[PDB]
Amino acid sequence: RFGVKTEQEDVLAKELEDVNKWGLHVFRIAELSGNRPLTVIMHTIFQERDLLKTFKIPVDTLITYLMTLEDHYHADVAYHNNIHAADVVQSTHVLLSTPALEAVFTDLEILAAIFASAIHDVDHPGVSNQFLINTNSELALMYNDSSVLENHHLAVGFKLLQEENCDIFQNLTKKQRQSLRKMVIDIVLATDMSKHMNLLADLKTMVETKKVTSSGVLLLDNYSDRIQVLQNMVHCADLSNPTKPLQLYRQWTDRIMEEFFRQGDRERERGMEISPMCDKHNASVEKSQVGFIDYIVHPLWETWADLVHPDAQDILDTLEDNREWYQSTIP
Ligand SMILES: COc1ccc(C2=NN(C3CCCCCC3)C(=O)[C@@H]3CC=CC[C@H]23)cc1C#CC(N)=O
Numbered sequence: 001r002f003g004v005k006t007e008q009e010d011v012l013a014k015e016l017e018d019v020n021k022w023g024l025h026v027f028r029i030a031e032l033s034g035n036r037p038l039t040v041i042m043h044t045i046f047q048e049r050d051l052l053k054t055f056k057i058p059v060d061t062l063i064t065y066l067m068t069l070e071d072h073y074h075a076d077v078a079y080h081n082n083i084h085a086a087d088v089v090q091s092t093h094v095l096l097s098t099p100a101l102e103a104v105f106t107d108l109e110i111l112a113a114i115f116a117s118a119i120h121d122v123d124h125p126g127v128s129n130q131f132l133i134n135t136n137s138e139l140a141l142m143y144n145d146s147s148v149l150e151n152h153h154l155a156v157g158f159k160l161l162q163e164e165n166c167d168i169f170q171n172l173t174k175k176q177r178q179s180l181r182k183m184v185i186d187i188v189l190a191t192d193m194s195k196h197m198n199l200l201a202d203l204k205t206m207v208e209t210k211k212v213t214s215s216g217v218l219l220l221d222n223y224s225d226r227i228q229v230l231q232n233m234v235h236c237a238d239l240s241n242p243t244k245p246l247q248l249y250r251q252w253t254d255r256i257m258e259e260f261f262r263q264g265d266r267e268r269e270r271g272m273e274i275s276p277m278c279d280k281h282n283a284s285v286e287k288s289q290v291g292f293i294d295y296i297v298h299p300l301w302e303t304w305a306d307l308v309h310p311d312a313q314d315i316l317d318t319l320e321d322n323r324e325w326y327q328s329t330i331p
């Protein structure tokens, strides 16, 4: 009430002490912040990594842009909302400080990875690309049916810099901006699951040929490799829910299932084929999660864990324990 925080902001601040740890209580932060998890977590991270001084970002501009970006995630969407954005941001933030990547990435690469995490699902309508395509939506027309959502996410994330007092990149040189931008685009476009197999194939190829001079940190000596790692990093963060403590993981599963079932309901009532996993009448959440883990998340994370051996061991362990838990609850 002029000077010091309210009691609610103090509780927020104490939760925010876990910002560098896997399994931050992100839902509690959403509650405590007045549904501003993305704004507060991004601001804490930016401070912690000293990104405001390094890139000469005025603080009011950062807050303004963050609030604006957060306002363009849909509160009526159960999974692909600002809490998910905040979790992928915070998850990418943890992955960036992994010991095997110490001093590997520049401040600009770190910025790109964080900013990309923040915008990666903005303005998500809670239905899939295929749904947008099959309905003939304007978004699908604009993007020629190709990575419709992910293209839209980028375009919105950047467009919003143009609102009043929102250009957080106003003090970067053109050279910094062009490089930031290319990285952010490459990162976000790689979040489309249709790219998953190729991304995973290339990450394996990198783990086969991996080099490691001086300390024990990875050697990445060209753009193609540096960007791959960043892309896989944010892709791991995006696919991190099953690696979190179970209480968190289940909240995410509840939410994704609600969103998917909602789409299935829209699909039914319109007489469309029901998309896989979206039919509330023919669901096994437990089988589905075990298959997601076995076909998608475990192969990716096991490969990530090889790249940065042994830094991801506890994350892989938690994933395997969660997978057993779900396997044991199968009817
Ligand atoms: C915590 O659970 C989940 C969390 C996330 C996802 C995601 N799936 N996919 C696709 C869906 C179609 C099959 C092809 C692979 C995965 C997405 O495109 C989403 C958007 C971006 C990345 C991954 C997202 C699924 C589940 C689940 C499940 C369950 N049926 O139990």
Ligand SMILES: [Mg+2]
Pocket: 120, 121, 149, 191, 192
């Ligand atoms: Mg997405």
Ligand SMILES: [Zn+2]
Pocket: 084, 088, 120, 121, 238
């Ligand atoms: Zn996402």
